[PDB]
Structure formats: C-alpha cells, structure tokens
Amino acid sequence: MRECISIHVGQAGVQIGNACWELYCLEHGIQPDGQMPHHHDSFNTFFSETGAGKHVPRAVFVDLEPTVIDEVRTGTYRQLFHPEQLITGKEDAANNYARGHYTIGKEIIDLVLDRIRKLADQCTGLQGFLVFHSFGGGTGSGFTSLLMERLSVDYGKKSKLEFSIYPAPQVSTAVVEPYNSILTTHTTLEHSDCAFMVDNEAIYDICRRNLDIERPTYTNLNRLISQIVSSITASLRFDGALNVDLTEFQTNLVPYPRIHFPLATYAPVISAEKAYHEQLSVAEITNACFEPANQMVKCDPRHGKYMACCLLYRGDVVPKDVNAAIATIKTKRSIQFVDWCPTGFKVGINYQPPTVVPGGDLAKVQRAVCMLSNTTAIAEAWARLDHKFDLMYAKRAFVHWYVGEGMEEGEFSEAREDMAALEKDYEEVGVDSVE
C-alpha cells in the first residue's frame, strides 16, 4: 500500500529496467509471465495484481526508437509487462537534446503522462517516482527534462528519484555529451528531488578488479545497478529491523535545495572463487564501501568531504556491529565530513539477504550494504563538464543542429551561467565556518 512507479526513458533506462525487473521477478518468486507457484504485502508496492495469479509491473517504458522496446517485446519478458505501457516513438532524438525536448518528444509526452496518470490513480499510497535515464543520449536528457517538468507541475509534492548515467571523464561514446548534460542538468536542477550519480567507467574498473572479469558486457553493469536499486527499495519491499522510506532519503541526503547529487556504492562485490578466504565482516564491508576504489563514480572522495551518507544493510546484520563500524569510520581522519554536519549517517537494516541471479557473476552472500553518499568531490566533476562545454562552445561547434531544432543560443549561455552558479555553491559550502 506504498506504491512507487518506475519510468524508463531512453535505451539506457530500458536496458537497466530489463535487469531490474528480472531481479525483482527473481526476488519475489515471480515467473516471467507474472505467475507465482519472511515474506508478507511485499510485492504489492511494485507489482499490481489482476484477478488471476498474474501480476504486472508498474513500469512505463518510453522510447523514441522502437528497436530496444521491440527487443523487450520479443524477449523472455514478453508476457510480463502491460502492453499499453511500452510506448514507442518513431524517430529517436539521435543524441540531440532539442529533438528530445522540443520537437519529437513533444508529440508523445501527452500519451506518456496519460499512462502515468492511469497508473497513479490505480494506486492508493503512491510514494514517488523512479526515473531510469542516461545523461548523454538525446532522448534521455531531453525527454527526461520534459517529463520531470510535467510531473512536477502535475504531482505537486511527491518523491522524484533519478538514476542518471554521469558522463565519464575519459570514455565517451557520444560526441555531444557536454551539451546534453548541461541542458538536462539546468532543467532537472529545479525539479528532481534526488538524483543518483553512476558512471560506466567506474563500473568497468570494479568489474575488472574485484569481480575478476576482464571483458564485461552492458549486461554486467546493468546487473550491478539493478542490485543497487533493489537494495534501495528493500526497505519498502521487505520487513526490516530499521526501515526507511524514500522521503527519508530526500530529507537526510539533501541539505540544500540544489545540492542533491549523491553518488552510489555497493558492497560486497566478490567473485564466486574468492567467496571463501574471507568471512565478510560487516565492519569489513563498511570499510569496503568507504574505500575510494569501490565507489561507482570516477571521483576520489579524498578530494572532497562527505556532506551526508546513507548506508542500507541487508541480511544477517546486528545493529551493534554497525554502530561500532560507523564509530571507527568516524574516528579516521581521511574521511572528513563538513564541520557543520556532526551527524553524517542514516542507517537502515533489512532482514532479507540479497539474492543472486542465476547466470550472474557475483556470489551468494549473507550480508550486503548499499551506500548513497552526498559529497563535495562531485563538484570537481562538474568543472570538467563545464570545461568541455566551454571549448565546444568557443567554436560554436554543433550549434546549428540545436538552433535549427527549436532552441536559442541565449539558452546555452543561461545554462552555462546556471552550471557556474552550482559550482560556486559547491565551493561555498565546502568551506568552513567562523566563530
């Protein structure tokens, strides 16, 4: 009776959703066709139920290119989703923000909002929104900005959580990533309650070093992000000794209206062969979470300060050990919070252990911990994007596409001003107080 819908925009969102809903259907013992042969209700929060034993997800898969959605319709998860939700456009934004926010997406935004409204009104205790969207793709940035503005107009005060794919510092598949990123950030900065920074480069690094797989496909990154999402929602979806709802997330991890970009982290991530040879202490996994090499965003936390942290544990966990481990973490100097926030933790414990997906890469563990940490190091990352933007704007490169697709240069200048203001705010907060 605490419902929460999922909205997947763009190819990244759709594939991540494939992984996430595979994970869920595995968790609650749900067959791909919605049937099912500590649990409570549990699945009601994400699965609505029809008359028969068939459950359907509360997901809205929207895209402008029918390729990936068609793959979904043809995949093993064909019987599952409500066929009306799988909204497909005709011509994708083609990595162009203007197309994804002014020209094309403007013609199916209404249908998407209609399906959203139907799903919302069929629910009673709606908690909030989960937008799964990338940052570089045109559909992702543009359509997500449009959709967030529309929802914020419609649903005045409700939780709105995003899982952006922050553009990596050195590996970029697109060429216009700075433009899409800056525009979508300038838009979503006033509507998204709490984003969730994740990058592909860091996940490549983690897969190579920790899991000992040298050649990972997007399937593996998707599985990892799905595990993170499942750990986020395990509080709603299960009985825990200290539960937490998404409103608690936005209250705890967001000190100021604008600074709401916490980065994700998960532990333990160890291969099946290395599953033994370590007992996986909860203090050990806490240390793993705080290890700068385990974060899922290519930013060294040591260059900034953790303004807030939220650690969600699951499995056979005992609160005293968590208290001891967090005390130890607070003792060390290399992990230096801001002076003005003396209490830098929210703790949540769940009774259900993480479940390993068959054919997966990780090993069956009894304890797991997902850290959502809002720090100041991420600020430097913005600088990089800013820098890129400046160069690609100093020559007015690629500007003609956006200009001719329903946008003006003054908008680019304004978004640059907004990003500069955000960087200024991060720097100002990073300093210490007097007296």
Place this chain on the structure above:
Amino acid sequence: MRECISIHVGQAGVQIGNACWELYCLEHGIQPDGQMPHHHDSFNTFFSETGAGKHVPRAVFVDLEPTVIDEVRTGTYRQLFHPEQLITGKEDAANNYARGHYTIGKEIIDLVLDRIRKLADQCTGLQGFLVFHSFGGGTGSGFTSLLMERLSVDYGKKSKLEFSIYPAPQVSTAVVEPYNSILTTHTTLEHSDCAFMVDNEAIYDICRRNLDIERPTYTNLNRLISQIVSSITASLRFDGALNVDLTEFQTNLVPYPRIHFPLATYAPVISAEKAYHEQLSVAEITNACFEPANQMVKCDPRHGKYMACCLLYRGDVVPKDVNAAIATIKTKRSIQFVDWCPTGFKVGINYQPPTVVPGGDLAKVQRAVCMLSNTTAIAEAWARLDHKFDLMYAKRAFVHWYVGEGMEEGEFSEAREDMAALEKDYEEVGVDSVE
C-alpha cells in the same frame, strides 16, 4: 409480459438487426431455428412462442430493395424470422428522401402498419418501439419519418426509441447526406421520444485504438451497436438489483420536449490479449465511459455540458462502488453538468454479465457498463450539418430530384428554419441562470 417490438428500416437497420438478433439468440440459448435444448419470463419480452419449442422474434424487417432481405432469407438465420414480416419493396429510395417518404414507401407503408398492428395486438404488455435506421440513406430517412408519424398517430402514448446513424463530420459515403438528415430530423423531431446518436467514424476509431484491429468490417461496428442495445434491454430481459424500463429512460434523459438526442457509449472494450494486465475496476470502467476518446459520436464532451447521464451496469457489480465512482466523477471539474440539474445520473444494475459472441473480437468480461448521455456538445454537430446544407442549398444543388419527386422548396426552407430553432434552443439551454 412487457413486450417491445423492433422495426428495422433500411440496409443499416437490417444489418444491425442481424447482429442484434444473433446476440439475443446467443444470450437466451436459442438455436437459429428458434429451438432451445438466473434465467426466468426472460425471453418472452422479445421472443414470442408458438406451440412447439420454436420461438420467433418480434421484428419487422422492411426495405425497398430486396437484396439485403434476400441475404437474410438465405443466411443461417433463415428458419428464425416469421416469413411474413420480411417486407421487401421493389425499387429502393436510392438515397432520395422524397422517394422514401412520398412516392415509393407510400405504397408499402400500409402493409408495414398492418404487420405492426398484428404483432402489437398479439402482445399484452407492449412497452414501446425500437426503430433501427440510418440517417443518410433515402429509405432510412424517408420511410422512418413516415413510419414514426403513422405510429404516433396510431399508438398515442407509447415509447418510441430510435438508433440513428449520425452522419460523420468527415467520412461520408453518400453525397446528399445533409438533405436526408435535415428532412428526417425536421420530421422526427415531433414524434421520436428518444433517439440514440451513434456514428461510424467514432466506432472506427474505437476499433483501431482499443480493440487493436486495424481493418474492421461493418460486422464489427454492428456487433458493438448490438452490444449497446443488449445492455439497454438487459433490464427488461433479466433480473437485476436495480431495474429500469424504457419509460424511465425517456423520463430521465429528456428534460425538454425537443432536446432528446443522447449519444451512446460502452465499456469495457479491450482485446483478448489485453484482457489480463488489468482487473477492470468498476470505477475504472466508469472513468473509461467518461473518457472523451471512448464516446461513440465524434464530439468532444468538454465543449459542452452533460445535461443528463444514464449508466447501466451488468455483471458482478456492487452498488457502493458505483456510488463511490459516481461521486468521484461529480468531484472533477472537466465534467461540468448544467447548474440547473444538480442530480445528473440514473443508475441501473443487472445480474447477468455480457456474453461474448463466438468468432467475435471482444473478450469475456465480468462487468460491463453502457452510458447513454444527453449533452450539449452534440449541438455543435448540428451546426456542421446546417453549414453543409447551406452550401448545398446556396447553389440549389440536387434540388431537382426532390422537387420532381413530390416535394417543394418551401419545405427545405422550413426545415432549415426548424434546425436553426433547435440550435437556438441548445444554445439557450447551455447558458446559466441568474439569481
């Protein structure tokens, strides 16, 4: 012991009747030859019975062209109908009102009235009339006008219900539709108790979008209208927790003597594959009924006000849910009734669920709802027809056929005046009251 005869005029009426009587024979377990291998009596209201186990319908299929009636006589429903009723003319009106009301139909109107009188006198608790007739065809308009005048002369005070096929705004199979429509409306405006607006264009739209059939034949539209008719008569033909007779229809949905043109709507209409993935709440289906995309007349209800509504439910329905759903509907602003009618609903519940015709297109549902709604938006539609008429009269186009077939221009001018008066009345009622 509450009998109600059916009169099918024109090809549209005859085919719709084919569908309707197929539906009935399926409902009461009646073989095509009138034999039968919660029910009560039930079928007595529409089926008269002879000595053997053979039942016959109380229908009078009249036409001026023997083609379609011959198809009926040759169809699988040959043994059913009483062969004396299948009245066939010789030369159809050929989409000419004057032929269908002055020249040709004048020569079989007497035989039709004679068969009507026989069927009426063989009944005891006659409720009223069901005229199934189009609006564009010559036979439809002319013969129906003549027949309605004759019956109103004969049967002073009895129910007279029509199922007109309102001419679509953009798809017109005929070329003289405005003339037939204006003439038949000017005539029937003083005799028909309650018409029932339905259009082909809206049904095309519904079949494409909801049922997901891109290439529908007239069979499908006929099946849908037959379902609507069956939902209308299920109160008479079955035991229900809150029944309603046709006199209640004319009392509730007709505020003034002239404004008696309610448009139809039906729900749910979902394909067999989409039958799952939704539990079909009675509140949900009520919302579907009020959705502007589900009405069966190409008129946006938002441009007018619902002067009255009548929702007839059937199947496993519980009155409290109906009350709650209607309360919610009354709460919303986009559904704005007139100020002077604070009670804008009649509710009826039946215990028998709708039955799906084998080889059909819809899916077996447990609850169904037919809405008959009298609004003000339909007024604009008249304007369109009026407009068309004006143009086709400004050049005196096609006038020579009607002139030479037993009619005068002054009649055209008078009918135009009458239509202008009706539009004026609709506009006057649409306004609000002072003090």
Place this chain on the structure above:
Amino acid sequence: MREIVHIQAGQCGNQIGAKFWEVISDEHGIDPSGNYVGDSDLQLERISVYYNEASSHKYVPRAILVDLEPGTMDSVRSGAFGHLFRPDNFIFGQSGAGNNWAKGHYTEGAELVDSVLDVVRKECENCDCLQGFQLTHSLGGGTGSGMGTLLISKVREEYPDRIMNTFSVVPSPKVSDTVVEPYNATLSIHQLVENTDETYCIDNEALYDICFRTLKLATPTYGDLNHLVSATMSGVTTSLRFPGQLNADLRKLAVNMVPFPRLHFFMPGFAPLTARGSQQYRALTVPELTQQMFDAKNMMAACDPRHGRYLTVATVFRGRMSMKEVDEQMLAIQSKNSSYFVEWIPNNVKVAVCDIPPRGLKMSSTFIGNSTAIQELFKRISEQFTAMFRRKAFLHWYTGEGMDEMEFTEAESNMNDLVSEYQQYQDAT
C-alpha cells in the same frame, strides 16, 4: 428484379456489346450455348437482371442489336458467344447510314426505329420491374449517332420515368477516324443533353495510351479496348447484380453524380491495371487502387482533371475489403487534392462496395468522375464544328436529307451554352 435492357447501335456499339456479353457470361458462368454451368448460386440469384430464363432451362441476354448494314451483325452471329442471342433481335437494314447523321436520324432510321421500338416494348412488358436502359453506341459513325439519338428520344417519350445510360465513344482529340465527325458529335450531343440521364464519355486515345504505357502492350487490338470498356460496364452494374456490404443501383449513381439536369457527363476509370510481369511486384491494397484511380494517366477520357475540378466522384469497389480502409483512403485523397474539388460540395465522394471480384483478381475498383475538365473536350469539338461550318463544308450531304442550317445553328448555340454552364460552375464561389 430491376431488369435492365441492353441496346447496341452502330458498329462500335455492337462490337463493344459482343465483348460485354462475353464478360457478363464469364461472370455468371454461362456456357456459349446459353445454359448455366456455373458453380455459385449467387450467379443465378440475380441472373434475371440481364438475362431471361427461356424454357428448357436456358438463358438469353436481354439484348437488342441494331444496325443498318448486315456486315458486323453477321460477324457477331457467326462468331462464338453469338449463338445465344435471341435470333429475332437482330434488327438490321440494307441502305447503311453511310457515315451520315442525316441518314441515321431522318431518312434511313425512320424505317427501322419502329421495329426497334416494338421489340423494345416486347422486352419491357416481359420484364417484372424495369430498372433502366443502357445504350452502347459511338458518336462519329452515322448509325450509332443518329439512330441512337432517335431511339433515346422515342424511348424517353414512352418511358419518362426509367433511367438512361449511354456509353458514347467520344472522338479523340489528336486523331480523327472520320472526316465529318464534328457534325455527328454536335447533333448527337444536342439530343443527349436533351434526353439522357447520364453519359459515359470515352476516347480511343486514352485507351490506346493505357494499353501502351500501363499495360505494356505494343499490339492493342480492338478486342482489348472493348475488353476494358466491358470491364468498366460490368463494374458499374455489379453493385446491383451482386450482394454487397454497401450496395448501389443505377438510380443511386444518377442521383449522386448529377447535381443539375444538364451536367451529366462522366469520365470512367478502372483499377488495377498491371502488366503481365509487373503484377507480382506490387501490393494489391485499397490505398494502391485509390491512388491509381486519381491521375490523368488512368482516365479513359483524354483530358487532364487538373485543368478543372471534380464536381462529383463515385467509386465502386469489388471483392472483400475493409470499409474503414476505404473511408480513410477517400479522406486522405480528398484532403491532399483540396484544390481539385469544388468548394460548395462537401464530402463529394460516393462509395459503393460489392462482394465478388471481377474474376481472377483479389479486389478491383471503378471510378466515375463528373468533372469540369470535360468542357475542354466540347470546346475542342465546338471549335472544329465552327470551322467546318464557316465554309459550310460537307453541308450538302446533310442538307439533302431534309435537315437545314438552322438545325446546326441551334445545336452549336446549345453546346456553347452547355460549355458556358460548365465554366460558370467551375469558377463558382
């Protein structure tokens, strides 16, 4: 019921009729002997509309073959599908019209028109409920023009209520198969606009062009052109000779297509038209047919529709199809060609749908467009007439049969008035 009587005047009319009856017999499964060997009862459910069931279970076409020279008559008689016409029908004279209209309407025709009317009356009384008359004739040849106009006038005298159809082969613009054809055309058109309900103008030029380009045939014999016209006529009548989801009759077409008493000249069209090889490389869908039927390169009358506007349009489909598809196609084609239709006739597309294909195919379509472009045709002919009248060339042949100049003066004035009316309604607002 609604039996139709077939009249064939002039050599062209008779040949077209021979091919036409071949086509109809193929439709209803009728052996050359005249007995039914078909397989589908629907063939016989309306077999009476064109045939009469003669005793011993045979069928005879309701044909009335007229001519003034026994040549083509005997050619028809000897050839196959001639042995089933009722032999008493073959009315023919000896003098021959000599490609003159004066002979075909005043001198020679006055001697056979009585016998023709008598056989007409016999056939009319034989029928249960007469539907109308269809006359198949030329406009150049003397017999066709003159005798057909005379028969039309007489029949309209004796049946002012029935409906009248004519398939008149209009002279082509570029070539001229005869020399005096402007005179015959003008006089025949005078009579037709006097006393006809509808006139299906056809040019041999357009049929040549279609057989050449669209069908990819370099050897178009008259058999093929007559085959095309026969297919068009069969498509026109199948709306009543066969069941249909939205049936039509000749009176329906007359009411829909003729806004004013005089302006009743239609250009036909047929679809699909595919070569022998280029057939499997194209999809047979309703949009394809609809888009085929609207272009100058598929109008059987040699005049670009774009030069004028479609006053009205009728469209008769065949074979099993979906009504919604047809409606959508008509909507689109009425939308995109908005300048090609007259403003003051909203929703100017009459639609009919049959249930039987014209044999061998999946679905066909017939177009009947009443447009203003045809005025050019008359314009052309009028001018030609004027020229050949300014010098009074060839005048003596027509004068010698009782006709005089004032006839020509009145006929030319009448045709110019008709063209003026077409022009007026083309630019109406």
Place this chain on the structure above:
Amino acid sequence: MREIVHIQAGQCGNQIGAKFWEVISDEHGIDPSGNYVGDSDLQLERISVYYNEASSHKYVPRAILVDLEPGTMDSVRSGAFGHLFRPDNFIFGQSGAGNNWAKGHYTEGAELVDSVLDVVRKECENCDCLQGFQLTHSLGGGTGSGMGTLLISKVREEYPDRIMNTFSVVPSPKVSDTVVEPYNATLSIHQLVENTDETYCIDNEALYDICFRTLKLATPTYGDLNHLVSATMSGVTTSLRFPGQLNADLRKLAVNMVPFPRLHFFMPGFAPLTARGSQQYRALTVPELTQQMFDAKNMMAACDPRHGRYLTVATVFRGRMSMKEVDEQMLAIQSKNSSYFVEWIPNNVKVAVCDIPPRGLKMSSTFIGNSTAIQELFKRISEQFTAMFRRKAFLHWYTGEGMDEMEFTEAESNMNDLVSEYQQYQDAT
C-alpha cells in the same frame, strides 16, 4: 519503420548498387527471386527499412535506378540479382550524358528528372516514416554528377527535413580516368556543399592499394572494389537495420560528425581486411580492429590523415563484443595520437555497436572519419580546375548547353572558400 530510399545515378552508381543489393539480400537471406528463405526472424523484424513486402509474400528493394544510357541498365537487368528490382523503376534516357555535366544537369537531365521525382514521390508516400535518402553516384561521369546534383536539389526542395547520404566516388589523385573530371568535380561539389548532409568521399586509388597490399590480390576486378564499398554501406546501416547494445541511426551520425553545416565530408574505412592465407595467423580482437582502422594504409580516401587532424570520428562495430574493451581501445588510441585530434573537441569518438556479424566473420568494424586532411584533395582538384580554366580548355562543350563562365567562377570561389574554412579550423586554437 524508418524506411530508407535508395537512388543510383551514373554507371558507377548503378554497378555499386547492384553489388550493394547483392550484399543486403545476402544479409537478410533473400533469394534472387525476391522471396525470403532465411532462418532468423531478426532479418524480417526490420526487413521493411530497405525492402517493401509486395503481395504473395515477396520483397522488392526500395531502389530507384537512374541513367541516360540503357546499356548498364540492361546489363543489370539480365544479370542475376536483377530479376527482383521492380521493373517500373528502371528510368533511363536515350541521348546519354556524353560524360558532360552540362548535359547531365541542364539539357538531358531536365527531361527525366520529372519522372524520377515522380517515382521518388510514389515511394515516399508508400513508406510509413521516411528516414532519409542515400544517393550512390560518381563525380567524374556526366550522368552521375549532373543528374545526381539535380535530384539532390529537387529532393531537398521537396523534403527539407529528411537526411541525405551520398557515396560519391572522388577522382583519384594520380590517375585520371576522364579528361574533364575537374569541371564535373567542381560543379558537383558546389551543389553538394549547397544541399547535402553528409558525403562519403571515396577514391579508386585507395581501393586499388587495399586490394593489392592488404588483401594480397593482384587481379582486382571492379566487382571486388564495389564489394568493399557495399560492405562499408551495409556496416553504416546495420546500426538501425539490426538490434544492438548501443544502436545508431543515420541522424545520429549526422549530428555527431557534422560540427558545421558545410564541413560534412567523411572518409570511410573497414576492418578486418585479411588475405585468404594470412587470416588464421592473426587474432580477431577489438584492439586489433581498432589499431587497424587508424592508418593511412587503410583509409578509402587517398590522403594521409597525419597531414591534418581528425575533426570527429565515428566507429560502428558488429558482432558480439565487450563494451569495456571498445572503450579502453578508444581511450588508448585517443591518448597516443593526441596531436592527431583537434584540441577543442574533447572525447571526439562516437561509438556504436551492433549484434550481428557481416556474415562469415566473428566481428567487424566500420570507421567514418571527418578530418581536415581531405582539404588536400580539394586543393588538388581546385588547382587542376584552375589550370584547365586558365586556357578555357574544353569550355565550349559546357558553354553550348546554356552554362557560362560565371558559373565556373562562382563554383571555384566557393570551393576555395571551403578549403579556407577547413584550413582555418585545422589550425584553430
């Protein structure tokens, strides 16, 4: 959805198209008759993008074959994989361009361009959602150059929103297959930089060099060169004709590769390229492909990239691979060649990955580099043009068709301006 229309102008364009359709049909498992005999449904899940499903379950390519001499057309028609083109498509003239551009764009082309545009319009209306146009033509031959430029101008008039692709075979630097090719090249380039979104420059010299050295073939027939260009085109389109972990469309490439309206000339490249024997002695890994694609000895345009900088680069892979591997390779190759990329475009490698190999391999790759080196090409041609214009040699043939000198003056000035822009952006800072 996103159907693409294929146009083939000039003899080279038509031969390349023949090989190209052979390749595509091999990809989707299409018999020469045009019916599908494949085994994997994914072939048909997007079969509509290039094919049309004609009735009786056949497939016809969305091709529009254009020429002015029936020779090569008939050669295509007679040869296998010609019997499935829709025969109405083969538009051809009789005069022949005579290797002149004035004929191919003013005199002869003005008579067939109308029919070509009409068939184009028919195909466009046939499609559900048009994606864009790909034109396969030369730059030397008169037909290719002139008629292709005319068609491009007309289409851009009638579809200013669609996307435009051209595979223009640029004249080689060393050899010169024609004598007046500087004039054709200059005029064609003028039109292209006017009204094209992207232009895939190719030289026969580079293809000769690749077939000689890399493939170890001493007997390169035109079949092989056309086969290579066809493989490149198939690799370009597979990003949308097939599913992929990171899919791409033509609009994506246009947005990523074209920073400024004019500078949209790309040099392609393909990998792997292994001789018949030297294949099993090499490992087929993503690093191997990536390192192969960046060198002058594997660019299908005869110009060393090292002489300039890569403005942008796109890379479309095929077959199952690991994304992290590709990312690592691109990072390394962008690191070590830092002087080979423009400073002010950070992260200038667009990446796309399909899921199906090019049929007969494990994994392939296609490179599309928009560099500044190509300026040399234009430089060369410009100079040649200047020389042949200084004496006004061959000028009379072009003057005699209505064109005048000022045309050449403006075109040369425009090309020099383009080269100036390329130079300016090459040394930008």
